Write a protein that binds this ligand. Structure first.
Ligand SMILES: Nc1ncnc2c1ncn2[C@@H]1O[C@H](COP(=O)(O)OP(=O)(O)OP(=O)(O)O)[C@@H](O)[C@H]1O
Length: 321
């Protein structure tokens, strides 16, 4: 009396940022967002539901997780169980394929993979749209990792209408790369910013414009246009935290050094553009045909261990056990 499933999902990096929840219970976002799914970083997850299990168990990278590290997995297991009318405890075993001791966020790839594995194990037979809706309830950004390449999370207005979809780009994403500069809370800083920042309305008033321009850059394969929009959108998101009460920044000293070096690279004719999420690492969007020039430039202040490249990656892969 057991049911099991497995999935692999890749990480994605938001170009137009997800930033603020309109509804916390269902993770419906204040604004739509757009990401690129990456080949380099991913999660592999298996889940087992078994009548003989006596409690929910989460093992990550071979290590038993404690109640605090298991809280998000357990809330996702509870809602997929309630939706199946399933009364069994589960065991989740996951491995994050990311750089060791690097601060990469694996909630996108982790929750997407778990959603896919549960979909298989419980035989939910979800379409890609409904699987994205399910993954959305685990982690907002996970709903975009259902898809490969460019993907947009439409904010919708309800559980039924908030979900992601691939953005056809006539394979332009296979000409692009992202270089991660590894530099020595997301959900709480976001909530504080939505509820208290004098700058948050300025964030909202500019997202739709940014999304339209990204769509137009994609349709014309205009890399400098794309890069300018996404770099400014990321800086706008980080500006909002300085208007929160109390104010805060996600940046570290090394973040600013990296951002400054990207601007210098661009001054020397290397078209590249940075973005940051809720932490200090700096991701650099660059065309493949320019990636080695960019790595050559940043060698002077960063070891090779700090420069990890990534390319466009596929949507979720589901596996029967
Ligand atoms: N492979 C995985 N499978 C399931 N859950 C995972 C996996 N990897 C991480 N998680 C869970 O997702 C959480 C996300 O943490 P992470 O630092 O990677 O991203 P985040 O967006 O900054 O989230 P948070 O603010 O909750 O820490 C982890 O603390 C863990 O509980």
């Amino acid at each position: 009396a057991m049911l099991s499933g497995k999935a692999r999902a890749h990480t994605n990096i938001a170009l137009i940022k997800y930033w603020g929840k309109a509804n916390e219970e269902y993770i419906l976002p204040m604004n739509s967002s757009l990401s690129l799914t990456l080949d380099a970083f991913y999660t592999e997850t298996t889940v087992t539901f078994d009548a003989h299990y006596s409690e929910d168990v989460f093992i990550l990278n071979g290590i038993l997780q404690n109640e605090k590290q298991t809280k998000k997995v357990k809330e996702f297991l509870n809602l997929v169980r309630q939706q199946a009318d399933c009364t069994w405890f589960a065991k989740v075993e996951s491995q994050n394929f990311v750089p060791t001791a690097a601060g990469l966020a694996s909630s996108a790839s982790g929750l997407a993979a778990l959603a896919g594995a549960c979909n298989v194990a419980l035989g939910l037979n979800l379409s890609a749209k409904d699987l994205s809706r399910l993954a959305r309830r685990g982690s907002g950004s996970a709903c975009r990792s259902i898809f490969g390449g460019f993907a947009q999370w439409n904010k919708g207005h309800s559980d039924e209408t908030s979900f992601a979809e691939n953005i056809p780009a006539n394979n332009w994403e296979n000409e692009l790369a992202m270089l991660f500069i590894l530099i020595n809370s997301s959900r709480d800083g976001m909530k504080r910013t939505v509820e208290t920042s004098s700058f948050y309305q300025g964030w909202l008033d500019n997202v739709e414009k940014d999304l339209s321009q990204v769509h137009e850059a994609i349709k014309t394969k205009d890399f400098p246009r794309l890069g300018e929009i996404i770099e400014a959108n990321g800086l706008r998101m980080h500006g909002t935290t300085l208007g929160a009460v109390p104010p805060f920044t996600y940046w570290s000293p090394g973040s600013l050094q990296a951002m400054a070096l990207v601007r210098q690279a661009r001054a020397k004719g290397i078209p590249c553009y940075f973005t940051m999420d809720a932490g200090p690492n700096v991701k650099v969007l660059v065309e493949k045909k320019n990636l080695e020039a960019l790595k050559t430039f940043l060698s002077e202040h960063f070891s090779k261990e700090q420069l990890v490249p990534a390319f466009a990656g596929p949507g979720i892969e589901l596996f029967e056990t």
